[PDB]
């Protein structure tokens, strides 16, 4: 009989790190835009790495943060391609989880020889009512303690909500 | 090779440690500041013989090491290979200098010759713990070790238990209290203060 300790999805994060720049990245930005229904953001590199073939302030990745119902919907699709399995290590100690998909057309998108097959990266910021405290301007705070989502608590939310297994190893 | 010990004796200059500024310093002769059975428990060595200094003088790394070997050799030969623990309690940190002559006194400022310990009046140089059997063997060890140092140093047997800060009269009771708790060579003094969950690990 808890009032608002209702573990919800605060946001869903999606990022395609092509690590190229130019055209490949502009191509991958269309994929997220088709998926999420909003323009994404290009992130640039921190610093040059001659190994990976990247340069400082060169656009490496594209990403986006989905919120609300659309984030619930896209999360659902992402678990369907993963078949509602995760692991213990897929959850972070902070009570967030995430998982890859190897190819976006699995979610439900049409391939093109140009706009190819960008594998991508789901990550779910779980939260509660009254987490905003941390990130507002004026009278800020820290979210107590018996209110912070545990790893265990986030696993059981997944185990209930999306009927998942959380396989061991 | 190096200068006589005569010439670097009195604590004349400011302390000049190996640092950003003073560099290219040659490594100290003495390195291993303790030897014997150092992996021993507080209980199995309470004697604490000290060589105290009675001159505000500088001791050479060279003379420390030599004194350390001298004492340890005798301790081994006398009682036994694993029957003591000796602690040297003066590390050569002060860097000593040397203006060398093949220009004259123009631009004379030394290169680092060597390192040295500065020792105050009443400060301990070496210290030894072993058994109540073995008092005389330590004394002579420190006695022999005196001859490697310049100046003058008393040999003294402290009223502490081992190399602990606690008076040996009260050491055993304190353990019975659990004021004090063995911790390798040393002993952890527990007070009242800390949360009660610490107190529940003891008394249980």
């Amino acid at each position: 009989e808890n009032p608002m300790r209702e573990l919800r999805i605060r946001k869903l994060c999606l990022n395609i790190c092509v690590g190229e720049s130019g055209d490949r990245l502009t191509r991958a930005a269309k994929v997220l835009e088709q998926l999420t229904g909003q323009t994404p953001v290009f992130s640039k590199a921190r610093y040059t790495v001659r190994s990976f073939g990247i340069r400082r302030n060169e656009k490496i990745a594209v990403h986006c943060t989905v919120r609300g119902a659309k984030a619930e919907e896209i999360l659902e699709k992402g678990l369907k391609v993963r078949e509602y399995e995760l692991r213990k290590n897929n959850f972070s100690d902070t009570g967030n989880f995430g998982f890859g998909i190897q190819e976006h057309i699995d979610l439900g998108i049409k391939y093109d020889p140009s706009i190819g097959i960008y594998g991508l990266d789901f990550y779910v910021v779980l939260g509660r009512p009254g987490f905003s405290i941390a990130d507002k301007k004026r009278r800020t705070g820290c979210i107590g303690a018996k209110h912070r989502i545990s790893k265990e608590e986030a696993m059981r939310w997944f185990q209930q909500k999306y009927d998942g297994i959380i396989l061991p190893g | 090779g190096r200068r006589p010990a005569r010439c670097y004796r009195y604590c004349k200059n400011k302390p000049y440690p190996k640092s950003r500024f003073c560099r290219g310093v040659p490594d100290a002769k003495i390195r291993i500041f303790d030897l014997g059975r150092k992996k021993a428990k507080v209980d199995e060595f309470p004697l604490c013989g000290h060589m105290v200094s009675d001159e505000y003088e500088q001791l050479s790394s060279e003379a420390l090491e030599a004194a350390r070997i001298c004492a340890n050799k005798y301790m081994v030969k006398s009682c036994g290979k694993d029957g003591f623990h000796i602690r040297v309690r003066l590390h050569p940190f002060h860097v000593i200098r040397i203006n060398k002559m093949l220009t004259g006194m123009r631009g004379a400022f030394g290169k680092p010759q060597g390192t040295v310990a500065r020792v105050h009046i009443g400060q301990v140089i070496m210290s030894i713990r072993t058994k109540l059997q073995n008092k005389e063997h330590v004394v002579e060890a420190l006695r022999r070790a005196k001859f490697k140092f310049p100046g003058r140093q008393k040999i003294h047997i402290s009223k502490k238990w081992g190399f602990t800060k606690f008076n040996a009269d009260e050491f055993e009771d304190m353990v019975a209290e659990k004021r004090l708790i063995p911790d390798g060579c040393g002993v952890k003094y527990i007070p009242n203060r800390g949360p009660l969950d610490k107190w529940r690990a003891l008394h249980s």
Partner: protein, 292 residues
């Protein structure tokens, strides 16, 4: 495991930030520029029209700063407004206007400049400001303390500021962030501004919801539907309130007495209680373990 970031050491070396900086209240960078006088002004005040919007309220205070703790010459709250006419929407821009306006009038009534400096009456919305009359006591002048509010176009603070300006305080301002001013053109309507002052932005939303879906309107404007505040009633309501403020701004409080004087709180546990309490925990541990 990792290196403990917050050691003894950490706390020994740690410096707190000021109390109100911790509480997330006072921008001391801005406070210094706002509040301190020029030393050659000496003890002449430096007033500021503080305005803060709470989740359910708008406060308007005039204050100068002394060393004991900045003194408050006058105040008006949005929760007073029921007296004057405003039943609902007390955090809305129109309410902000009333609340500011009311502060000016109440302030002016103290100094006897109620008859001099009527200020703007008809509510155009355009650039207005008070010229001090010669051979008369000059116009009161303070400055707007926005606080931590993101000072954008249409911010409710500037709703209050507009009010106190029309009320007859000379507070300097531009019209670059009254609601009306256009970013991609750079002119000011001052009929858009009037609408906002009169609550027509709210009335139209009310009319838009009722047209589309009854239930959402019923949900959105529940206290508006109770008290019977309708879209067509709205403009009149705020104009009545403006007049009533303008005719009597004086605050009378309530004569508070008949207090039982009882402790809701929990007082501080005395040394000796705390001293025993560990004593009992020590015993209780011992007697407990001497069994199993």
């Amino acid at each position: 495991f990792v290196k403990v970031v917050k050691n003894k050491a950490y706390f020994k070396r740690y410096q707190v930030k000021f109390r109100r900086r911790r509480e997330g209240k006072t921008d001391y960078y801005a406070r210094k520029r706002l509040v301190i006088q020029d030393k050659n002004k000496y003890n002449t005040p430096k007033y500021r029209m503080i305005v803060r919007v709470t989740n359910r309220d708008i406060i308007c205070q005039i204050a100068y700063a002394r060393i004991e703790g900045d003194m408050i010459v006058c105040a008006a709250y949005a929760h007073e407004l029921p007296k004057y006419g405003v039943k609902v929407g007390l955090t809305n821009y129109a309410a902000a206007y009333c609340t500011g306006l009311l502060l000016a009038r109440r302030l002016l009534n103290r100094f006897g400049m109620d008859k001099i400096y009527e200020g703007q009456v008809e509510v155009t919305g355009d650039e207005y400001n008070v010229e001090s009359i010669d051979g008369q006591p000059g116009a009161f002048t303070c400055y707007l303390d926005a606080g931590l509010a993101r000072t954008t176009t249409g911010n409710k603070v500037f709703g209050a500021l507009k009010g106190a300006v029309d009320g007859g305080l000379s507070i300097p301002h531009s019209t670059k962030r009254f609601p009306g001013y256009d970013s991609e053109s750079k002119e000011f309507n001052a009929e858009v501004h009037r609408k906002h002052i009169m609550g027509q932005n709210v009335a139209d939303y009310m009319r838009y919801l009722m047209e589309e879906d009854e239930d959402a309107y019923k949900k959105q404007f529940s206290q508006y539907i109770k008290n019977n505040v309708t879209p067509d009633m709205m403009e009149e309501m705020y104009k009545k309130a403006h007049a009533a403020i303008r005719e009597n701004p004086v605050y009378e409080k309530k004569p508070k007495r008949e207090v039982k004087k009882k402790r809701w709180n929990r007082p501080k546990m005395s040394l000796a209680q705390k001293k025993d309490r560990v004593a009992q925990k020590k015993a209780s541990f011992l007697r407990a373990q001497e069994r199993a």
